[PDB]
Design a binder for these strands. Structure first.
Ligand SMILES: [Mg+2]
Lengths: 94, 56, 222, 146, 97, 113, 98, 226
DNA sequence: GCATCCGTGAGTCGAG
């Protein structure tokens, strides 16, 4: 299973809303290069290589992990799309 | 060219699929459980390994 | 290459030990012997026989004490005793008390070089007028010897007890496949050891590996 | 030359050569069609000074997951003794490639009683259940099948 | 078994345990000798079998024998296939089959 | 592993003293798992002969071949004195450790079957 | 046996005779008639299904053979008996869910 | 109460077979010692095998030689059975030459003899030759461990050389008996007997010793915790 | 209201 899946389903009125939130967040992480993350250095998802532990490349894993913390806010009509995209491009340029 | 494939390629592939899942499907797909998602584990050899509990 | 040994420990009573990578198959080659050894040949101390004053046998019931003789001998089985004298092969512990009191392992009269690891181990509950006078024999041994197999008696009316020598309470091991570069067939050995606290999981392991190594020297001279 | 190594003078892979996916079995050139070189192609071509060849590479290669040893070739050309090819066909080449196939995971075994199954695990001899005299078993069939 | 006996070996410690569990299964007649019982099992086509991993036996006696088995024409080598992108179809533009 | 033996050698003999039962057993008069009456109640030789302090001991006994997983016995688990096989104890443990909750684990399992 | 026979895979001797030559490629037999017959052998020939059809000599030089005796084995036959698989030592028991 | 080092007996028939007794041992050590050795013996004991073959006038394994009864396939299958012992332990590779013809049945003994190389089974049939049949080959033999398929090693000394599957292990079979023993005071003691068959390239004994060394060496790996 | 005609359906994936 995915870690804390039960809690995640707990967080939402519809499992599909969970899925959407996770997907969108992952898109955000990818777009802004993970530098917009709400995770602290010790919470950063890791990945085993020959070299060593590097940041987990998988943005969805990240997204769900972030969601568990409660640092993230989700819902409908929070902010106009313009404002969101642009404020994020100001806060974390690409 | 298959002979031109170094091992670092494979190591990279392991990095590529990380966290990712793939869909497995058997026919006839009678109900929605005829397709299921699994995080894949790369294996040598040519056949797909399936978990015993999902066979039913 | 040279396999890497790794350790995770909880107190003196539990440990996990990982050894990887190993050539194909070697995971169980090492794992099984060590387990057999760890469950049999590791030196420890057990309660072999017990005498209760008034009591005449195992299934008798003590008046003024709640737990029947059986429950008592069981609690005894749970007694963890540590001989500080490397040459000490056995000891007798005496305990007497009475009245409204709950008897605990600390009530055993202090002896020579002897540690009671679990002083708080309950033995029996005694009520008003309830009397308990008993002597229990603790021997250094290995493995597990049922009562009827050692069959030791210091005195008549003593009841022999199943001897839980092994300080190792449990051993589980698991081998799983591991990849090192191009090699996908390698073995990773995980070994979990539960001790009663007298020895240490790491200690127990090392004693086991040692026993084995030494046993390998038997194929020396015809 | 790495790519052409096992090809004889006429372009056909040499008998005995081991061929893997991607390898050329029979070299062949086709004439490039009406060419519309993109402006990018012109600037590039200009930068390297080389000229675009008349012919595309259409050579027959070993398909993915196929290959082996080249055991045979046959070559038929227009206008040599005894041979006539369908109209317009200049020549026809056939390469016979062999492979020695060992049993493997995914392969299928059966007996004459309808017991059939795929090989799921190839165990090293020392894991195989064995008789007291040390003779290991060859195959392990689950009784639940009966 | 005969050869074994001549070669100077007696019933293995483990064969005894398996024989125990066997007579618990009603497979052999109790009180009969270890050889006689092992034979009783052999007539039922069962043998004492040693797990190569542990060295310990299989708790029960097991059916072992020669079976005729064929390798059928269906091999993974032929059947394994995958595609990222590839040939599409004229009218539909959907991938070929 | 969770099945229990039923042996017919004992064949429901009644005894006044457990010691009598045990001696009988060792004489080969009565089988380890046989239903027998001692004192008043119906019991088995194995339960009396073998009484384990904790599950770890039962299983250590099984390891040494003193008993089999399917032999019925007496094990002290979670404060209560149980009559079951080491096997069933092992199953309950499997579940327990699997879900990392021992009390719930105990609730879920049907131990007597 | 009769199956290997009626399907022409194995090669047989026409009349009583004596083996003259034996090669991987061919078998030459001198019969009673005195006439010297040569039998070419199909070697590593591909079939519709891609399986190899080849015959191999089952006799040796100077060997006496009667009419109907086996001179060569088909694909998947052993001394004239149909050989589809192998005889393996098998144990019927579960094994770790594999 | 503590047991003391047991008697170690050795019963050998030539270089092919051996029986190795150890008694007495604490209860259970029969297999505790028996098995890990069997496993190691069956798997990790170095030997020698034919890695590659070159036949004069043969381009690949699916060929057939004129004059010869055996197809190259069967010939390779026979060379697969060749057991060759290297006398000098510093020697890791040999190339045997065989040149034969005329109405003869070639055997392993027909290889041109090499120094520090002994063919344990010179009686091994290789190819049956006929009038005018010429068989001239170079077979490479290597020392190695376990089972390495031609596909893995791909060893060719020359252009037309045919890589061969190498079954290195010199050990043909391993059994171990665990029987009851006593010192009179103690019952339930067990004596251990390792019966070990070999191709002859190494010796049941040599095998055993190598096995033990492997095992102890492995026990070493438990040295440095982390 | 019933007989009878025509027209439309009748597993999936695979290989080939
Ligand atoms: Mg008892």
């Amino acid at each position: 299973a995915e870690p804390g899946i039960d809690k995640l389903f707990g967080m939402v009125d519809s499992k599909y809303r969970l899925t959407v939130v996770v997907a969108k967040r992952a898109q955000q992480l990818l777009r802004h290069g993970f530098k917009n993350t709400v995770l602290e250095p010790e919470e950063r998802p890791k990945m085993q290589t020959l070299e060593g532990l590097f940041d987990d490349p998988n943005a969805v894993t990240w997204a769900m992990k972030e969601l568990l913390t409660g640092r993230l806010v989700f819902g409908e009509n929070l902010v106009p799309e313009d404002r969101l995209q642009k404020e994020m491009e100001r806060l974390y340029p690409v | 060219r298959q002979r031109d494939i170094k091992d670092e390629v494979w190591d990279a592939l392991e990095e590529v699929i990380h966290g990712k899942v793939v869909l497995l499907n058997r026919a006839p797909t009678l109900h929605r459980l005829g397709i299921q998602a699994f995080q894949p584990v790369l294996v040598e050899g040519q056949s797909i390994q399936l978990h015993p509990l999902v066979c039913e | 290459k040279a396999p890497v040994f790794t350790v995770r420990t909880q107190g003196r009573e539990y440990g996990e030990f990982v050894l990887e990578p190993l050539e194909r198959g070697f995971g169980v080659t090492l794992g099984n012997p060590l387990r057999r050894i760890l469950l049999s040949s590791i030196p420890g101390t057990a309660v072999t026989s017990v005498y209760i004053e008034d009591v005449l046998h195992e299934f008798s019931t003590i008046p003024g004490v709640k737990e029947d003789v059986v429950e008592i001998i069981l609690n005894l089985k749970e007694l963890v005793v540590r001989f500080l004298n490397p040459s000490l092969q056995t000891v007798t512990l005496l305990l007497k008390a009475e009245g409204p009191k709950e008897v605990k392992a600390r009530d055993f009269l202090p002896v020579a070089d002897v540690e009671i690891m679990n002083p708080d181990l309950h033995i029996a509950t005694l009520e008003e007028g309830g009397r308990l006078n008993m002597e229990v024999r603790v021997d250094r041994g290995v493995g597990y010897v049922p009562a009827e197999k050692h069959g030791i008696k210091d005195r008549i009316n003593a009841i022999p007890v199943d001897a839980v020598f092994s300080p190792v309470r449990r051993v589980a091991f698991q081998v799983e496949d591991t990849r090192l570069g191009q090699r996908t067939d390698l073995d990773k050995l995980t070994l979990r050891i539960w001790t009663d606290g007298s020895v240490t999981p790491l200690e127990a392991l090392n004693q086991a590996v040692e026993i084995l190594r030494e046993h390998l020297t038997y194929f020396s001279n015809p | 030359e790495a790519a052409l190594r096992d090809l004889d003078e006429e372009g056909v892979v040499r008998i005995g050569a081991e061929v893997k996916p991607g390898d050329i079995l029979v070299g062949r050139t086709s004439f490039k069609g009406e060419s519309e070189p993109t402006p990018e192609e012109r600037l590039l071509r200009s930068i390297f000074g080389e000229k675009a060849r008349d012919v595309k590479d259409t050579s027959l290669r070993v398909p993915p997951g196929e290959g082996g040893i080249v055991v045979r070739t046959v070559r038929l050309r227009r206008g040599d003794p005894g041979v006539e090819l369908k109209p317009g066909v200049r020549e026809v080449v056939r390469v016979y490639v062999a492979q020695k196939r060992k049993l493997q995971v995914g392969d299928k075994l059966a007996n004459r009683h309808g017991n059939k199954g795929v090989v799921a695990k190839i165990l090293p001899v020392e894991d195989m259940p064995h008789l007291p005299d040390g003779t290991p078993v060859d195959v392990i069939l689950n009784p639940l099948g009966v | 078994f005969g050869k074994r006996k001549g070669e100077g070996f007696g019933v293995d410690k483990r064969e005894v345990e398996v024989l125990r569990r066997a007579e618990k299964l009603g497979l052999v007649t109790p009180g009969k000798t270890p050889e006689e019982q092992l034979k009783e099992l052999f007539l039922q086509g069962k043998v004492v079998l040693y797990d190569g991993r542990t060295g310990e036996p299989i708790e029960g006696p097991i059916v072992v024998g020669q079976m005729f088995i064929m390798k059928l024409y269906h091999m993974v080598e032929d059947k394994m296939h995958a595609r990222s992108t590839g040939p599409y179809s004229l009218i539909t533009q959907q991938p070929l089959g | 592993i969770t099945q229990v033996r039923k042996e017919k050698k004992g064949a429901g003999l009644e005894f006044a003293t457990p010691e009598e039962a045990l001696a009988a057993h060792e004489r080969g008069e009565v089988a380890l798992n046989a239903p027998i009456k001692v004192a008043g109640r119906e019991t088995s030789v194995g339960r009396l002969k073998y009484v384990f302090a904790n599950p770890d001991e039962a299983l250590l006994a099984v390891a040494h071949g003193i008993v089999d997983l399917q032999d019925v016995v007496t094990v002290r688990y979670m404060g209560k004195r149980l009559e079951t096989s080491p096997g069933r104890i092992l199953f309950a443990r499997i579940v327990a450790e699997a879900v990392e909750d021992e009390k719930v684990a105990w609730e879920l399992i049907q131990l007597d079957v | 046996e009769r199956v290997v026979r009626d399907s022409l895979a194995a090669l047989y001797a026409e009349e009583d005779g004596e083996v003259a030559k034996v090669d991987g490629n061919r078998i030459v037999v001198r019969y009673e008639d005195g006439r010297l017959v040569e039998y070419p052998l199909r070697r590593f020939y591909r079939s519709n299904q891609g399986t190899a059809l080849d015959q191999r000599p089952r006799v040796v030089v100077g060997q006496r053979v009667r009419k109907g005796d086996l001179l060569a084995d088909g694909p998947a036959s052993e001394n004239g008996f149909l050989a589809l698989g192998q005889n393996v030592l098998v144990a019927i028991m579960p094994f770790d869910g594999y």
